[PDB]
């Protein structure tokens, strides 16, 4: 079990937790703000998944300061995790190419 694979896996579990915590924290942060739409868990969760992936649909977003703070944590966690996987694939590709040359 290599480091890059363990990291990829740890990042996945971690991202899943961030999404969940984020879903809960967003509702708690947004309810109480007139016009807020990130006020129920089911869509908050869909919102966090679309924030971590940055898919950008524009159908849901935070309007309060803490929601936005929560939003940054999810964004960064998402961008970082998917980037870590990229790095884990590079380590894989570099290692087997080295083999295909002997070393």
């Amino acid at each position: 079990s290599a480091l890059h694979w363990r990291a990829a896996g740890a990042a996945t579990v971690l991202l899943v937790i961030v999404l969940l915590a984020g879903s809960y924290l967003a509702v708690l942060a947004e309810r109480g703000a007139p016009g807020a739409q990130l006020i129920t868990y089911p869509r908050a969760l869909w919102w966090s998944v679309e924030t971590a992936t940055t898919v950008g649909y524009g159908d849901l977003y935070p309007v309060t300061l803490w929601g936005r703070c929560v939003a940054v944590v999810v964004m960064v966690a998402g961008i970082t995790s998917f980037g870590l996987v990229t790095a884990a694939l590079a380590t894989w590709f570099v290692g087997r190419e080295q083999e295909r040359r002997g070393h």
Partner: antibody
Framework: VQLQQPGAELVKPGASVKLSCKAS????????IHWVKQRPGHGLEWIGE????????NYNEKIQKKATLTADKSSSTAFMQLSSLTSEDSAVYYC???????????WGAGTTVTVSS | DILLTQSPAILSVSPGERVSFSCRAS??????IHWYQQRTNGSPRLLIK???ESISGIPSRFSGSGSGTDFTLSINSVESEDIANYYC?????????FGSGTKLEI
């Protein structure tokens, strides 16, 4: 019986009463308890909400703030503090449970609050 | 906040007919509308959630439709027990808000 609310409360003008709502059954951390005001013959007016497993409360800002929400995690009871009441504050006050999904699946029988000397 | 207008305040119909209640929202809210039934001296009772999802324990006689800013609660074959006040409720934007209510009359 989801929400248990006392049948009534008599209150003198200027005085203040504290209503209770004892819940039971499936309880989650994502649960919100709501309070709704119904003046005889009229419709339903949303007062405020509380998230028990955190104690955060939100109030309807379009009306005069006469309430104060609180919760006691151990006895699974939600409380509403109505202060300095007048004839306008006389009505039935319901409490309801919301699973963070936006609709009130269950209500309390309601507590009739009367304000007179 | 979101204003929910309930068209005719009173609805008079004959036994057995199909009847429809209207709920107009001041802005687009998807399908985040819910209907409640309240009888004389009773408390509100959730009938339909998210505009059309039936609730367990509710007569199949009840159904809902719409999305955006126009919603309808329908009862196929009205009857005595259905005499009550009906209210819509939105969960799209925070303050939640309720409709003014519609009384069914046979």
């Amino acid at each position: 019986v989801q929400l248990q609310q006392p049948g009534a409360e008599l209150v003198k003008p200027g005085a203040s009463v504290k209503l209770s709502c004892k819940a039971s059954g499936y309880t989650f951390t994502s649960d919100w308890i709501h309070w709704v005001k119904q003046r005889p013959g009229h419709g339903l007016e949303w007062i405020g909400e509380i998230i028990p497993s955190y104690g955060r409360a939100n109030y309807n800002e379009k009306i005069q703030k006469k309430a104060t929400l609180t919760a006691d995690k151990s006895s699974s009871t939600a409380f509403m503090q109505l202060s300095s009441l007048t004839s306008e504050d006389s009505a039935v006050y319901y409490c309801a449970r919301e699973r963070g999904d936006g609709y009130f699946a269950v209500w309390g029988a309601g507590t009739t609050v009367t304000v007179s000397s | 906040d979101i204003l929910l207008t309930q068209s005719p305040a009173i609805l008079s119909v004959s036994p057995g007919e199909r009847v429809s209640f209207s709920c107009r929202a001041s802005q687009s809210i998807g399908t985040d509308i819910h209907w409640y039934q309240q009888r004389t001296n009773g408390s509100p009772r959730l009938l339909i959630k998210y505009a059309s999802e039936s609730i367990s324990g509710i007569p199949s006689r009840f159904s809902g439709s719409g999305s955006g800013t126009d919603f309808t609660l329908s009862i196929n074959s009205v009857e005595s027990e259905d005499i009550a006040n009906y209210y819509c409720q939105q969960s799209n934007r925070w303050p939640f808000t309720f409709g003014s209510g519609t009384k069914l009359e046979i």
